[PDB]
Design a protein around this ligand. Structure first.
Ligand code: ZN
Length: 375
């Protein structure tokens, strides 16, 4: 048996794989930061009719170690069909078991979104009516940060922004973007016709290509948490954010959605700008409308989430808060679970790429309903 992670988004350190009943592995810290939680590795040469038992020995020292409870690892024999495996968490770490039907299998913290798939997503987007690559930024390591614009009418007046995966380990984020973009291929989509008559979409499928490729969880190549870099961005340390901010200054913003994934909470939720000094009655109302409409259409709830910010106590270094206040627009962080969306249990897969894609499509329906109220 051999274990490796020498591929896009791979992350693992092999401790000892000599005994199938006691496979010991360790998660690797981010390129330039102590954070870690995301893991992705491949196993080959496994013996048939043999139970294999894995342990991520340093799970207890991960960035969000409390989030391991209730979490089931994801696996795949072909890289296309992903399924959850029996998992437990204790002082020795995260454990999971599988009696593989095949000699090779891969495991990951979430269904991975490769940079190769990303290129295909962009390729597909550019083949869609009204879609153009408006601008392209460059990451610390030279990778592209495409900003796509969906514009089908020269007289639209609203700019709706959606960016994803600032935190590289939250792969559900780009899956959400794939679903959103793929919906644009539909003929006779009445809701989208209405939306695009009044608005243009500004999309960034992946905000941290370096981190994703390298299997990071939280930071870009330089070790910066991009979602804490908005108040003081740097063309050198956080070029990904510097880029988006420059483009926002050029075009304007009337709506902002920052797509993320949360390790702990087993529910899809959205966090707003209630702590912003600029949190006006207008924005408070729009936040209610957004949640009300999305809850009626997609896998989304309003009971569970992050503790709200006291009036005026928001951290303006976070994208949602920064963009919302700078542009006086409706702004949310959309958070999808690494576990399952417990309101609609599907244990075999837990939250998945497919469900992330669907949420992207349901969010589009929600935007179509609110477009007349954004300004
Ligand atoms: Zn995040």
């Amino acid at each position: 048996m051999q274990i490796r992670a020498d591929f896009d988004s791979g992350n693992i350190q092999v401790i000892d794989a000599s005994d199938p009943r006691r496979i010991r592995l360790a998660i690797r810290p981010d390129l330039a930061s102590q954070h870690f939680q995301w893991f992705h590795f491949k196993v080959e040469g496994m013996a048939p009719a043999t139970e294999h038992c894995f342990t991520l020995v340093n799970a207890g020292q991960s960035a969000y170690s409390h989030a391991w409870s209730g979490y089931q690892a994801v696996a795949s024999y072909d890289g296309e069909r992903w399924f959850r495996v029996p998992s437990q968490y204790d002082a020795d770490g995260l454990h999971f078991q599988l009696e593989p039907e095949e000699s090779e299998v891969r495991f990951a913290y979430f269904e991975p979104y490769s940079r190769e798939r990303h290129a295909r997503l962009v390729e597909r987007a550019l083949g869609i009516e009204g879609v153009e690559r408006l601008a392209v930024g460059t990451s610390v390591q030279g990778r592209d940060i495409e900003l796509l614009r969906v514009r089908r009418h020269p007289d639209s007046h609203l700019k709706l922004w959606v960016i994803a995966q600032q935190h590289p380990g939250e792969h559900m984020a780009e899956w959400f973007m794939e679903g959103l973009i793929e919906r644009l291929q539909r003929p006779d989509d009445t809701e989208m016709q209405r939306l695009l008559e009044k608005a243009d979409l500004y999309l960034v499928p992946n905000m941290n290509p370096d981190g994703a490729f390298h299997g990071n969880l939280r930071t870009n190549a330089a070790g910066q948490d991009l979602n804490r870099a908005w108040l003081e961005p740097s063309a050198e340390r956080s070029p990904e954010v510097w880029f988006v901010q420059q483009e926002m200054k050029r075009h304007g913003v009337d709506l902002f959605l920052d797509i993320h994934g949360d390790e702990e909470i087993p529910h899809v939720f959205a966090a707003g700008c209630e702590g912003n000094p600029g949190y006006t009655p207008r924005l408070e109302r729009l936040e209610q409308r957004f949640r009300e409409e999305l809850m009626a259409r997609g896998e989304f709830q309003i009971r569970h989430g992050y503790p709200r910010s006291a009036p005026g106590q928001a951290n303006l270094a976070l994208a949602c808060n920064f963009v919302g206040q700078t542009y006086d627009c409706l702004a949310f962080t959309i958070e999808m679970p690494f576990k399952d969306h417990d309101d609609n249990p599907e244990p075999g897969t837990g939250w998945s790429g497919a469900r992330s894609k669907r949420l992207g499509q349901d969010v589009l329906s929600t935007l179509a309903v609110l477009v007349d109220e954004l300004r």
